[PDB]
A and B are shown apart, each in its own frame.
With several copies, the nearest count.
Chain A
Amino acid sequence: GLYEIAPVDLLDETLKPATDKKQLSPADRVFGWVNQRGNGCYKGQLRIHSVTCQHDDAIDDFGNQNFSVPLAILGQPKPEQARFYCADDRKGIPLEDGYDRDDGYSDSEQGLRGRKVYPHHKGLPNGYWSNPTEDRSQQAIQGHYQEYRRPKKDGLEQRDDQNRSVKGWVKPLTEFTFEIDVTNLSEVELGALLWLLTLPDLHFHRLGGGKPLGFGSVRLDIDPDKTDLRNGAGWRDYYGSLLETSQPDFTTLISQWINAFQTAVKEEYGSSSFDQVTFIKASGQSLQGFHDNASIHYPRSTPEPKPDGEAFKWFVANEKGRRLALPALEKSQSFPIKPS
């Protein structure tokens, strides 16, 4: 069957990519925009540059240059799973459990679930990433299976054309420095950026590939001694002379800019608290990871990642069972392994 509404129709016109210069949202100004439908483009006010690795031996040669870990299966996203990708409201609330699939992309008052994020894999034990050529996928070492590695079948590597393999990776605890050059950011636009770059402890960004498998969790923090932010008044002083002159101390203002951002979110997405705003609470849970120590892995009908990888049959059991939808991210609810 075909659902009755196309997903584009379950997204509000104010959330679709911008079609003209006057509908540029904050990221379309900060990071820039090109119209996908006609004329119109804007150079982004934010430039990332000067990325340097500090560590010389940053790359995990797993043992020999020819070694390679076979890397789970990174499958393609399938939004046909309406209980995962469709929202019962344009607030982004999940579908209700127990309803038949036809309920999915069914009414214009349905919504999309919004921006897909890969929550940090909190609580991965010591040695989880260690010695990754070893097929520890079939034992619950400290309560987790080696979820990032394709299991062996019959004792041989499953280097099929569904998975990729990697000859190495950047080790954990390796460090990169990069710089952001910003232009004409307002205090909200700047405070939003600096909030991301000054998240509290154990908030982690997700980067690169393999994010469903736990890869690419990174901590971003600012180096204040190499940061030089001034408003246009402070640049008139800088360009006022060829002699050196005092830069302002931006560290007195960083908290003010973050508050300017935070109060704007409280005011436009009406809440008594900033942290209770649903996309803020959801985003926070993504960066922080789930607290209940349940493992993060694709749905399957068995604790172990069995080698044949029949992840589809959890969805079969769910269809005949309690037809549960993907829980709201800020609710931190785990799925059962038997959705029935």
Chain B
Amino acid sequence: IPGSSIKGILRTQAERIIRTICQSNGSEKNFLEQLRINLVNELFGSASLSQKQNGKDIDLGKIGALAVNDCFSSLSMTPDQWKAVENATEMTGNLQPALKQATGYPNNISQAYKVLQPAMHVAVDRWTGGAAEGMLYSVLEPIGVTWEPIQVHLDIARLKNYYHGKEEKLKPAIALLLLVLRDLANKKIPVGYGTNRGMGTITVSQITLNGKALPTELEPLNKTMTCPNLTDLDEAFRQDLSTAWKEWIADPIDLCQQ
């Protein structure tokens, strides 16, 4: 699961939260303009774009303080075992050995297909029934592939530089990120292909926040959370974040402008 993919879904939910609060529509903006909204420009980053402000020339671009790493399965195959699957030609023919091999169950198609399952799909024509001409397709659904933990990295030092050193300006970005993680844990963010079409729902069983050299008021982030709703973080800390979050919602300034 590319980190480009985990970052775009997190960014999409982050932006949707921001736009929801500000009631700000995205339909008229082009895609580069849709991306460019507050807090996500610092967390997720913004494109380099030199603009003359007034005599002064400023780059609107900044690298993301938030970085996501590609995710990988517990489940590995030799480079040829997978080529045996990619180059299979008959779903009930040579594909069955290929998947039995690649899943590690060479003699249990049942166990093999509890890991990688071929799924046929039809579009059904609305007057006739049956199936629409040509609209037969198949997915290799990784129904039982096990995955490694997703690893996100927030450069607090990079954020603090954007906020010109002001550690008090961190709290809304942290509050946003925890709201995005609350949605991720509540199945509100599906990942990958086909999310509306039978795929992409994840169950989040643990989130481990593990920062180093954090500023003293952000140190209650150092927590292993297992409740989806963040209730493993101290309520006094979640209320402090909520207060700074609400103060920002009341006036959603560009928090790195000074």
Contact = CB atoms under 8 A, between A and B. Distances in A.
Interface of A: 7, 31-32, 43-44, 46-50, 76-77, 79, 85, 112-116, 118, 179, 181, 232, 235-236, 239-244
Contact of B188 (A46, A77, A181, A236): A181
B23 to A, nearest CB: 7
A48 to B, nearest CB: 7
Contacts of B126: 115-116
A85 B127 contact: yes
Contacts of A179: 187
Interface of B: 17, 20-21, 23, 125-130, 175, 178-179, 182, 187-188, 190, 195-196, 198, 200-201, 229-231, 233, 235, 238-239, 241-242, 245-246, 249
A240 B249 contact: yes
A242 B245 contact: yes
A242 B238 contact: yes
Contact of B242 (A85, A236, A241): A241
Contact of A47 (B190, B231, B246): B190
Contacts of A31: 196
B129 A116 contact: yes
B201 A49 contact: yes
B20 A239 contact: yes
Given A49-B200, A115-B126, 15 more contacts: A7-B127, A31-B196, A47-B195, A48-B198, A77-B129, A77-B130, A114-B127, A116-B127, A181-B187, A239-B17, A240-B242, A240-B245, A242-B242, A243-B238, A244-B229
A114 to B, nearest CB: 7
Given A232-B23, A242-B245, A32 B128 contact: no
A31 to B, nearest CB: 8
Nearest to A11: B127
Residue with the highest number of chain A CB atoms closer than 10 Å, among B178, B196, B198, B246: B196
A240 B21 contact: yes
Residue with the highest number of chain A CB atoms closer than 10 Å, among B17, B127, B187: B127
- Top 6 A-B residue pairs of the complex, sorted by shortest distance between their CB atoms: A77-B128, A49-B201, A242-B238, A241-B242, A77-B130, A44-B196
Contact of A236 (B21, B229, B231): B21
22 contacts: A31-B196, A47-B195, A47-B196, A49-B187, A77-B128, A77-B130, A85-B127, A112-B127, A116-B129, A179-B187, A181-B187, A236-B20, A236-B21, A240-B21, A240-B245, A241-B242, A242-B179, A242-B182, A242-B233, A242-B241, A244-B229, A244-B231
A241 B246 contact: yes
B230 A242 contact: yes
Contact of A46 (B125, B129, B196): B196
Residue with the highest number of chain A CB atoms closer than 10 Å, among B125, B126, B190: B126
Given A47-B190, A48-B198, A49-B201, A242 B175 contact: yes
Contacts of B20: 232, 235-236, 239
Contacts of B242: 240-243
A312 to B, nearest CB: 18
Contacts of A85: 127-128
Contacts of B127: 7, 79, 85, 112-116
Contacts of A116: 126-129
Nearest to B174: A242
A49 B190 contact: yes
A50 B201 contact: yes
B205 to A, nearest CB: 15
Contacts of A181: 187-188
Contact of A79 (B128, B175, B178): B128
Contacts of B17: 239
A247 to B, nearest CB: 12
Contacts of B187: 49-50, 179, 181
